[PDB]
Amino acid sequence: QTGNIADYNYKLPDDFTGCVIAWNSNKLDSKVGGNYNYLYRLFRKSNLKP
Amino acid sequence: KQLSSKFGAISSVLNDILSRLDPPEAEVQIDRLITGRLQSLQTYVTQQL
């Protein structure tokens, strides 16, 4: 997938033979003041290998 | 002459497809192009035989 994620942070190959697990967690790691511990990489010189 | 056939893809150039599309759609387009060229090659081999 092309975008901010899966192009500079964690790119997945065309063949994978697996899948992901996603669920909502808005109380274990989400705080009223903003959890700044989680962050992403925005700018890279080139693309990322899978 | 079969090298200039789109075969249902965006274009008929190998390096042109990979340089603009994302890898999944490029994978499908290249797969279609290669299986079309392989079918053409098999037809040519059968005709020559």
- Residue B1 CA to residue B14 CA, distance in Å, equals 15
Q: Report how far Cα A32 is from the mean position of its chain's Cα atoms.
A: 22
**Alpha-carbon separation of residue A48 from A6, A7, A8, A38, B17 (angstroms):** 8, 6, 6, 20, 19
| A46 touches B: beta carbon within 8 Å | no
Q: Tell me the backbone φ, ψ of residue B11, rounded to 5 degrees.
A: -145, 175
Q: Where do we find the tokens 């992403």? A: A40
CA–CA dist B4, A36 (Å, integer)? 53
Taking the C-alpha atoms of residue A17 and residue A15, their distance in angstroms, rounded to an integer, is: 6
B22·A14 Cβ contact <8 A: no
Residues 6-45 of B with CB under 8 A from A: 22-24, 27
